[PDB]
């Protein structure tokens, strides 16, 4: 059900990431470096366990989870959140909760590209990834 998402993906477009980061309280210097990074996202599965790596010249993260089962996560910007990832309408929907706040990270495949939509507050960022062979 999550198979088309699997593989190695490289960032090729980003819209409103600064707005999203600023909404989360990320400092200007971090936003500045992040605005010039092009991460690689690697999504792998082993049975019911997905592992999602995000690699860059700036920061790296890795999470492992089962769909539909809450997990603790420490984000790239050091938020300690309660997370859950599901499939909804064919999209991979990652919801993070902390301090009564929420943000969603929604991934969907359009014409073979992976679109990541990040929403926090009123900020909506769209990042496009292309698959590495
Ligand atoms: C791990 C790569 C880090 C990139 C720099 C991020 C700076 C700190 C910002 C944190 C806010 C949360 C961002 C989540 C999305 C990361 C980029 C993406 O996967 O397309």
UniProtKB/Swiss-Prot annotation:
What is this protein's function?
FABPs are thought to play a role in the intracellular transport of long-chain fatty acids and their acyl-CoA esters.
Kindly indicate whether the keyword Cytoplasm belongs to this entry: yes
Q: Where along this sequence does the record place binding of hexadecanoate?
A: 127-129
Recorded family membership:
Belongs to the calycin superfamily. Fatty-acid binding protein (FABP) family.
Q: What InterPro entries does the database record attribute to this sequence? A: Calycin, Fatty_acid-bd, ILBP, Lipocln_cytosolic_FA-bd_dom
Q: Which PANTHER family match?
A: FATTY ACID BINDING PROTEIN
What protein name applies here? Fatty acid-binding protein, heart
Q: Which CDD domains match?
A: FABP3
Q: Modified residue Phosphothreonine is at which positions?
A: 8, 30
Organism name: Homo sapiens (Human)
Gene this protein is translated from: FABP3
Entries under Pfam families matching the protein: Lipocalin (PF00061)
């Amino acid at each position: 059900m999550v198979d088309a998402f699997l593989g190695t993906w490289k960032l090729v477009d980003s819209k409103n990431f600064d707005d999203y980061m600023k909404s989360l309280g990320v400092g200007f210097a971090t936003r500045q470096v992040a605005s010039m990074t092009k991460p690689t996202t690697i999504i792998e599965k082993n049975g019911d366990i997905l592992t999602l790596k995000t690699h860059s010249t700036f920061k790296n993260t890795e999470i492992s989870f089962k769909l539909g089962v809450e997990f603790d996560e420490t984000t790239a910007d050091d938020r300690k959140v309660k997370s859950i990832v599901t499939l909804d309408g064919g999209k991979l929907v990652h919801l993070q909760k902390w301090d009564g706040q929420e943000t969603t990270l929604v991934r969907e495949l359009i014409d073979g590209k992976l679109i990541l939509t990040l929403t926090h507050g009123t900020a909506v960022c769209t990042r496009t990834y292309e698959k590495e062979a």
